[PDB]
């Protein structure tokens, strides 16, 4: 209810390179996994959260080098005995390549899939993920459909060479005596940045994950 | 006034021609240095270069807009509509003119805007916008909500695209002209747009003593036609 | 071997650090660069973009009704057309502007700025407004007369169907404490609006809003806009 | 604890474990102003509900440090304690002023008493 | 269902190298033991798993350098007190030296065997193993018999020189209050790889270790 | 990589070490400094001004 | 001492990382490589050699 005002002063313009708007490491998944799903699973992308999904949509080609961070914490339940330092393995599968199905699949074992073992007890984890798109910058908007038959005029806009890849960590010596809860955060921070065509950003509130429908407020 | 003469074709415009390129680039072929890691692709001169006027449209006092998404418009028209269903690659820009034909007595302004990868919104439901929704063929869509440009963005800051605007009290004519616009060297034409020209009436036409009617007329002219190869030897 | 020893902060993870990390294909050769149109290497490019402004504040309208204004025959001399104060952090005719949604996404903004009126009414309507500007501090007109002895443009919409404003300076933060006014742009219809037989008897008037080069842009932060 | 702003992408933040060295971090000079003051003679506004912040300059303001614990809930129970230190750099310095004699009397209002 | 396609843009063959090819560092062995065999046993090789095996066939011979990376995890059994921080000790046996038959052995102690003495909340130990043949390259097609006589004749395309050596794993503080199991994760990242005489790649599936047997399917 | 031993006192903090430290906004660009009359250099500079005495020392 | 601190990601594992590792024995002397017919430098040589094609393909 106060009206101040104060002399501003300022120069320079690298704070509002695009690099900067876009190259801030935010969270992009959280998910939490008892200890026997049994695992943790997800599809890389970055519209999950809606403040980052709109920064990006400001935007129609974005091309960028992914850089992951995987901060694990750790929650007993029910005597107490200290927390494990528990192993835990961080594996990138390509868009290529088959998703493990349970915790002693045999794709954890995979030479062609990157794989990081680290422990609860120490930095956490981090990889750099290059572009790896067939296109040579991934579409935020796809005015297109993916074939020309059926069971695929179901799927607009959503285009199979914007997949960024999936990633599976799970806990190597998993089954312990008593219990155990562990949270996964995932940060995603873009590096070599470059834009084109910006576009209108959105205003009305989202509705669905990858369909850009809009509906009132 | 001068004649917009493109091989087979020729439209009498204004003086106005002010030719907005989006972006500030001419539309050309692909480049060799980027042709060698795909195949190689043979260009049409003749005739896919050539201005293609639809059917005017009529533009009332209670107009909300039309979309045309290209090259779905001109997926089955002529020789290029030919071209797209034996090439199976396509690759070219565009030159959209738009005309309307009004007395001096008519009020209204339109906002011709190109907007690249237009994704259509479906208020009010979770369900994506099915093949009938998108692919309107030569005829068109119509904008149910222009206000938020049928995409949950704001037509406010539709300015952003390569835009041209009709007065009728200053001009009755608008050419925007497209270059690729794809992050692929080239793409299918059968089920992706790349453009989508959309006309919108900001200011309601209005009159006392006219016709109420104001036809508009739309042309759309492929510039660099690209598509692959069908006739390569398979000798030696 | 060489002796080190652990400085404070060191096994941290900071969301704003910049270092090199492992590549996880080392050998992956990425896809080529082709040439993209419309590249952005700073979003101070965004703000120079002219965008719509709502100048329509009248409560009740909703749509595209909110983007243009009307002047009538029915409308007397000497009526309020419109009312834009000049603060892009605030509900107005400025909010839905380009310039004001990406300089959201900052905490300081500093610059010039630029108005654009297009009056798109038929060809032989004609009349005069009077485009007043209040300098920050000051206090907004309330008829022609107090417009017309600030600093003002008489602008015939007859012979110019566009005009264009040059504002001098705003400026702006946030610190309940909110950034007092920056100033405002006023309209005031000189004479009464003057139409043939045949022509309508209401006109409508649009307005754009955009940036010079010397806007600038402080301390990134999240828009409140979900 | 379960805040959304805690997500920020705009806010550093720091993780650091409890075995692990001190977490250190650098703030720049964050003001509106080119230098902090720590005596205003003026007040906010022009308005009420200001002239009762004497004193006070809201760009004097030099932002808010939150800290929690990621992992808090636990079977049993824990008490933890947060120091935090201070060490200003590229330290500058204008119009020195007469060394305060009184007691403090407020945190934000240079009162004095007796003594 | 979904027959897309997409333009693929590419340049380069650093990819297709054999180096990159084969130097990637895959699961070799994997084995679990108990508190009180009382260790871990197990003489290097490829063949172990048929992903790797069908990799390295595709070539007569290979020399490489060989680097063993070893990733110790620990489980506990039935009240709980935490994960035991136990020292382990990993050696090489060449093949010219005995190796070890207990958790109390005298081999453990040799002086010309390697030895590396690492603990489990460490990161994971590694060394290079450099190449040890006799020729001048591994041949994994063997066409003829180790000897003249009986009792070698049943031994068909097993040639002494190929062997890699041996790996042991022990605990070194082994006997504790209550329990443990730990399991052993040997990673093989082969080296300064060199390849020669290209063969056809296997096509059935395999029927035996050591003896290119094949059966229908 | 480069073979390396921790020293006797490493994981430490002291109140008056001198090391750098991360700075939190890489990319903020500060307020630029304008001219302010009164700079003090060093505190010495005080101890020079004259200042009163309570030479009354008559309780 | 050099005043060093950990980055992020530093006692991990990465399946694909490039380091040089301590040799187990720094003073083997392996055996001298010999001329072997048919090095292969690219598996690119392999795609190239003509193969049969199972052009038969009543079931």
């Given at each position: 209810?106060?009206?101040?005002?104060?002399?501003?002063?300022?120069h320079?313009?690298?704070?509002?390179?695009?690099?900067?708007?876009?190259?801030?490491?935010?969270?992009?998944?959280?998910?939490?996994?008892?200890?026997?799903?049994?695992?943790?699973?997800?599809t890389?992308?970055?519209?999950?959260?809606?403040?980052?999904?709109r920064?990006?949509?400001?935007?129609?080609?974005?091309?960028?080098?992914?850089?992951?961070?995987?901060?694990?914490?750790?929650?007993?339940?029910?005597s107490?005995?200290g927390?494990?330092?528990?192993?835990?393995?961080?594996?990138?599968?390509?868009?290529?390549?088959?998703?493990?199905?349970?915790?002693?699949?045999?794709?954890?074992?995979?030479?062609?899939?990157?794989?990081?073992?680290?422990?609860?007890?120490?930095?956490?984890?981090?990889?750099?993920?290059?572009?790896?798109?067939?296109?040579?910058?991934?579409?935020?908007?796809?005015?297109?459909?993916?074939?020309?038959?059926?069971?695929?005029?179901?799927?607009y806009?959503?285009?199979?060479?914007?997949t960024?890849?999936?990633?599976?960590?799970?806990?190597?010596?998993?089954?312990?005596?008593?219990?155990?809860?562990?949270?996964?955060?995932?940060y995603?921070?873009?590096?070599?940045?470059?834009?084109?065509v910006?576009?209108?950003?959105?205003?009305?509130?989202?509705?669905?994950?990858?369909?850009?429908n809009?509906?009132?407020? | 006034?001068?004649?917009?003469?493109?091989?087979?074709?020729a439209?009498?415009?204004?003086?106005?021609?002010?030719?907005?390129?989006?972006y500030?680039?001419?539309?050309?072929?692909?480049?060799?240095?980027?042709?060698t890691?795909?195949?190689?692709?043979?260009?049409?001169?003749?005739?896919?270069?050539?201005?293609?006027?639809?059917?005017?449209?009529?533009?009332?006092?209670?107009?909300?807009?039309?979309?045309?998404?290209?090259?779905?418009?001109?997926?089955?028209?002529?020789?290029?509509?030919?071209?797209?269903?034996?090439?199976?690659?396509?690759?070219?820009?565009?030159?959209?003119?738009?005309?309307?034909?009004?007395?001096?007595?008519?009020?209204?302004?339109?906002?011709?805007?190109?907007?690249?990868?237009?994704?259509?919104?479906?208020?009010?439901?979770?369900?994506?916008?099915?093949?009938?929704?998108?692919?309107?063929?030569?005829?068109?869509?119509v904008?149910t909500?222009?206000?938020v440009l049928?995409?949950?963005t704001?037509?406010?800051?539709?300015?952003?695209?390569?835009?041209?605007?009709?007065?009728?009290?200053?001009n009755?004519?608008?050419?925007?002209?497209?270059?690729?616009?794809?992050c692929?060297?080239?793409?299918?034409?059968?089920?992706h747009?790349?453009?989508?020209?959309?006309?919108?009436?900001?200011?309601?036409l209005?009159?006392?003593?006219?016709?109420t009617?104001?036809?508009?007329?739309?042309?759309?002219?492929?510039?660099?036609?690209?598509?692959?190869?069908?006739?390569?030897?398979?000798?030696? | 071997?060489?002796?080190?020893?652990?400085?404070?902060?060191?096994s941290?993870?900071?969301?704003?650090?910049?270092?090199?990390?492992?590549?996880?294909?080392?050998?992956?050769?990425?896809?080529?660069?082709?040439?993209?149109?419309?590249?952005?290497?700073?979003?101070?490019?965004?703000?120079?973009?002219?965008?719509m402004m709502?100048?329509?504040?009248?409560?009740?309208?909703?749509?595209?009704?909110?983007?243009?204004?009307?002047?009538?025959?029915?409308?007397?001399m000497?009526?309020?057309?419109?009312?834009?104060?000049?603060?892009?952090?605030?509900?107005?005719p400025?909010?839905?502007?380009?310039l004001?949604?990406?300089?959201?996404?900052?905490?300081?903004?500093?610059?010039?700025?630029?108005?654009?009126?297009?009056?798109?009414?038929?060809?032989?309507?004609?009349?005069?407004?009077?485009l007043?500007?209040?300098?920050?501090?000051?206090?907004?007109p309330?008829?022609?007369?107090?417009?017309?002895?600030?600093?003002?443009?008489?602008?015939?919409?007859?012979?110019?169907s566009?005009?264009?404003?040059?504002?001098?300076?705003?400026?702006?933060?946030?610190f309940?404490?909110?950034?007092?006014?920056?100033?405002?742009?006023?309209?005031?219809?000189?004479?009464?609006?003057?139409?043939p037989?045949?022509?309508?008897?209401?006109?409508?008037?649009?307005?754009?809003?955009?940036?010079?080069?010397?806007?600038?842009?402080?301390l990134?932060?999240?828009?409140?806009?979900?």
């Open positions: 209810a106060i009206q101040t005002r104060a002399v501003i002063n300022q320079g313009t690298s704070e509002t390179l695009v690099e900067n708007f876009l190259g801030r490491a935010a969270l992009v998944m959280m998910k939490d996994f008892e200890y026997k799903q049994n695992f943790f699973k997800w890389i992308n970055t519209r999950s959260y809606v403040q980052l999904r920064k990006f949509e400001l935007f129609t080609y974005i091309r960028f080098d992914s850089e992951i961070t995987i901060v694990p914490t750790i929650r007993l339940y029910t107490y005995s927390l494990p330092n528990l192993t835990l393995q961080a594996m990138f599968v390509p868009v290529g390549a088959p998703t493990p199905k349970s915790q002693d699949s045999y794709e954890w074992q995979s030479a062609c899939n990157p794989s990081v073992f680290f422990k609860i007890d120490d930095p956490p984890a981090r990889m750099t993920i290059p572009f790896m798109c067939i296109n040579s910058a991934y579409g935020m908007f796809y005015d297109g459909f993916a074939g020309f038959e059926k069971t695929a005029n179901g799927l806009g959503i285009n199979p060479a914007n960024m890849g999936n990633l599976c960590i799970r806990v190597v010596n998993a089954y312990q005596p008593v219990q155990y809860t562990i949270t996964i955060r995932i995603l921070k873009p590096k070599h940045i470059k834009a084109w910006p576009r209108p950003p959105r205003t009305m509130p989202y509705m669905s994950i990858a369909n850009t809009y509906t009132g407020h | 006034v001068l004649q917009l003469k493109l091989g087979n074709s439209i009498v415009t204004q003086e106005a021609a002010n030719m907005c390129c989006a500030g680039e001419w539309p050309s072929y692909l480049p060799d240095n980027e042709a890691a795909i195949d190689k692709p043979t260009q049409p001169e003749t005739s896919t270069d050539r201005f293609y006027t639809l059917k005017s449209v009529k533009w009332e006092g209670t107009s909300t807009g039309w979309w045309w998404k290209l090259p779905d418009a001109l997926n089955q028209t002529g020789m290029f509509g030919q071209n797209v269903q034996y090439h199976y690659l396509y690759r070219s820009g565009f030159l959209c003119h738009v005309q309307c034909n009004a007395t001096k007595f008519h009020q209204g302004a339109l906002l011709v805007v190109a907007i690249p990868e237009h994704q259509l919104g479906k208020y009010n439901t979770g369900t994506s916008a099915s093949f009938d929704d998108v692919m309107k063929g030569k005829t068109g869509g904008f909500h222009p206000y049928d995409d949950g704001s037509l406010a800051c539709s300015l952003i695209f390569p835009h041209q605007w009709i007065n009728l009290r200053t009755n004519s608008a050419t925007i002209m497209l270059p690729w616009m794809n692929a060297p080239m793409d299918f034409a059968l089920r747009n790349q453009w989508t020209l959309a006309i919108i009436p900001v200011v309601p209005n009159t006392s003593g006219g016709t009617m104001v036809p508009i007329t739309v042309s759309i002219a492929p510039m660099c036609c690209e598509f692959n190869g069908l006739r390569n030897a398979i000798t030696q | 071997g060489v002796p080190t020893y652990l400085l404070p902060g060191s941290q993870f900071m969301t704003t650090d910049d270092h090199s990390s492992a590549p996880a294909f080392p050998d992956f050769s990425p896809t080529p660069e082709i040439h993209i149109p419309g590249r952005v290497h700073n979003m101070l490019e965004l703000v120079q973009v002219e965008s709502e100048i329509n504040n009248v409560a009740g309208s909703s749509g595209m009704e909110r983007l243009r204004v009307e002047i009538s025959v029915q409308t007397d000497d009526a309020l057309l419109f009312n834009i104060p000049l603060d892009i952090q605030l509900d107005g400025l909010r839905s502007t380009l004001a949604n990406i300089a959201r996404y900052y905490t300081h903004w500093s610059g010039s700025m630029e108005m654009t009126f297009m009056f798109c009414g038929s060809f032989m309507a004609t009349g005069k407004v009077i007043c500007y209040t300098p920050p501090g000051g206090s907004c309330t008829d022609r007369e107090s417009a017309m002895l600030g600093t003002h443009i008489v602008w015939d919409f007859g012979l110019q566009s005009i264009t404003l040059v504002i001098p300076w705003i400026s702006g933060s946030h309940k404490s909110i950034n007092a006014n920056v100033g405002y742009v006023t309209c005031f219809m000189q004479t009464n609006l003057i139409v037989k045949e022509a309508a008897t209401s006109t409508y008037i649009i307005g754009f809003a955009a940036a010079k080069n010397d806007f600038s842009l402080r990134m932060r999240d828009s409140p806009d979900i």
